[PDB]
Design a protein around this ligand. Structure first.
Ligand SMILES: [Fe+2]
Ligand SMILES: [Fe+2]
Lengths: 244, 237
C-alpha cells in the first residue's frame, strides 16, 4: 500500500471533500468522500493531473448544506459508483451496511454506523490491517466535528443516539487516530481521537448534559436543507439529459 | 523530536497559518508561521489547549492582504518574539538572513531567501536529519502557491527574481517535499515539489515566458495593501 491523501475545501458550505488513492497499484485506484457539485471540475482536474483511477464517490450522510457531486461525477467518469449507507434512505449505486469494507487497491476503509446527526451517518475508517495507513484515519462526517458535532434536530437525528455512536464507534479507536470531519467553521482541518476525548466541549460532557445543551442552542433553520436534502436523496442527478 | 503540526485557515484573507511544536521537549515549544490578527484568540486558545509554549511568531514576508497577528501575540504573551527577514525592511524582534536556522526544542527550520513576490520573501524548510520531518516541508509564503504564485508588481517584487528563487531554492528540494503556501483560493491545502515542477501553470515555463505571462495578468489593485503594508512594517503595532 502507498496512500495519496488530499483534503479539499468548499468554501460556500465549509465542506471538506477527501481524496484517497493507492498509488502503489498500477491503476492508482482512488475514492472521494463527500464531493460537492460545485467543485466537481476542480476534483476531476486534480484526479487527472495525478493520474488516478476514480472507483467510488462516497458520502458520509445525506447532506443538508450542499448538493452532492456524486451524480455529476457519474455523468463524467463512466464506471465510477456512488456509495452511501443503506440507512440513509438515499439513492446510490452501492449501499453500505455497518461492518462493510470498501477497497481501493490494497487500501481499505471500514464502515462504522454513527447515526445521530441523521439516521444514515457512517464513519469511514482506514483499515486496521498490518499493511494499512498508520495512524488510522477516521472520516467522521458531521457526527464528530473538531471541537464540536453536528446538529440533531433534522433528518431524524437524535442527541442521545449521536452521543452513543461517538462513544462506541469513534472514541474506541486508538487515541492517535486522525479525525477528518465533513465541515469546519473555525479554520481547523484535523484533530485526533485523543485530542477530542480531552477537549471536545460537546462530547466530553456526560450524556444528559450534552442532551440538555444541544436541545437549547436555538439554531436557525438550515438555509439550504429544503433544496439539498431532496437533491441528495436522488444522488444529485437531474431528470432531463444534460445539455452542452 | 516529535512534531505536532497544524495548518489553520483565516477565511477573510484566505491565509494559512502554520503551528509547529516539538512535543518531546518539556516546554512543548511552538512557533506560528503567518499568524493573522483576526485569529489571534483562536490560535492562543489552541496553543493553551495543547499545552504548548509559544516561542516565535514568524512571517514569510510582509503581507499585503491581512494584518499580521505577531504584534497582538507579543502583547498577549509577553516573551514571544516576532521574526521576519532582514530583507523585508520591517520591524521584528529577530531578523533572518539566508541560511539562518530557527529551532524549537529539537525541531529546526532552514531559511531560504525566495524574493520575487516581495523583496523580503523567505521559505522556511524543515531541517535535514533523521530526527526531522520526512518528507521535508517547505512553507513557501506567496512565492509558490498550489498551482500558482503571487503577483510581482508590488512590494518591490520582480518576476525575474521570483523565477530564479523558485528554481534555485524550491525546485532543488527532493520531489516529495511538501509545499505549504501562505494562501489558497481554490480549496487546496498542500502540494509537493514534484507536483509543482510538473503542473504549476506558470513556473514550469521558461524564464522569459514566465516574465511575459506575469506582465500580461489582468489584476485589480490589491484591496488591502495601503492598510496592511503600513501595519505590517511596524509588526502590527
Ligand atoms: Fe450534515
Ligand atoms: Fe503576499
Amino acid at each position: 500500500m502507498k496512500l495519496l491523501f488530499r483534503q479539499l475545501f468548499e468554501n460556500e458550505s465549509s465542506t471538506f471533500t477527501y481524496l484517497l488513492a493507492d498509488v502503489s497499484h498500477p491503476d492508482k485506484p482512488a475514492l472521494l468522500i463527500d464531493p460537492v457539485d460545485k467543485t466537481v471540475d476542480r476534483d476531476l482536474k486534480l484526479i487527472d493531473e495525478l493520474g488516478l483511477k476514480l472507483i467510488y464517490a462516497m458520502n458520509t450522510h445525506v447532506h443538508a448544506d450542499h448538493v452532492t457531486g456524486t451524480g455529476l461525477l457519474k455523468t463524467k467518469l463512466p464506471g465510477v459508483k456512488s456509495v452511501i449507507s443503506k440507512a440513509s434512505g438515499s439513492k446510490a449505486d452501492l449501499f453500505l451496511e455497518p461492518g462493510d469494507k470498501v477497497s481501493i487497491g490494497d487500501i481499505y476503509l471500514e464502515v462504522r454506523a454513527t447515526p445521530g446527526h441523521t439516521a444514515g451517518c457512517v464513519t469511514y475508517v482506514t483499515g486496521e490491517g498490518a499493511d494499512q495507513p498508520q495512524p488510522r484515519m477516521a472520516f467522521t462526517g458531521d457526527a464528530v466535528l473538531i471541537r464540536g458535532c453536528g446538529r440533531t434536530d433534522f433528518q431524524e437525528g437524535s442527541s442521545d443516539q449521536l452521543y452513543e455512536s461517538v462513544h462506541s464507534q469513534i472514541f474506541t479507536l486508538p487515541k492517535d487516530t486522525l479525525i477528518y470531519p465533513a465541515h469546519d467553521y473555525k479554520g481547523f482541518e484535523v484533530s485526533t481521537v485523543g485530542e477530542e476525548m480531552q477537549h471536545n466541549p460537546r462530547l466530553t460532557k456526560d450524556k444528559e448534559t450534552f442532551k440538555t445543551i444541544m436541545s437549547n442552542l436555538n439554531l436557525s433553520y438550515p438555509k439550504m436543507i429544503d433544496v439539498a436534502v431532496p437533491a441528495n436523496m436522488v444522488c444529485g442527478l437531474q431528470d432531463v439529459p444534460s445539455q452542452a
